[PDB]
Amino acid sequence: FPKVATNIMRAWLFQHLTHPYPSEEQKKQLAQDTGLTILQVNNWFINARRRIVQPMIDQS
DNA sequence: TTAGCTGTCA
DNA sequence: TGACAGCTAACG
Numbered sequence: 001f002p003k004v005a006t007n008i009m010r011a012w013l014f015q016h017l018t019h020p021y022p023s024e025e026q027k028k029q030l031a032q033d034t035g036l037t038i039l040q041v042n043n044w045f046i047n048a049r050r051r052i053v054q055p056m057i058d059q060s
Numbered sequence: 061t062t063a064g065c066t067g068t069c070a
Numbered sequence: 071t072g073a074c075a076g077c078t079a080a081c082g
Contacts, residue, residue, distance in 0.1 A: 045064095049065085
């Protein structure tokens, strides 16, 4: 929900459109850089992939 | 058994 | 768009 939390999560995503699956090291590092919880970080990407990444694939 | 994906509500 | 119950794939 934090406006900042979105930005930090958006960057890594588009910085890894081919491998949008972070590691346990990056998951916590994102959580610390956002203050969110691990579960919050986990769910965000899973939603982001099918709402940000996948739609662009369809357009190709 | 855990990471990830689908379906889905407020 | 952030939640989580439920199903699915990579026997210890």
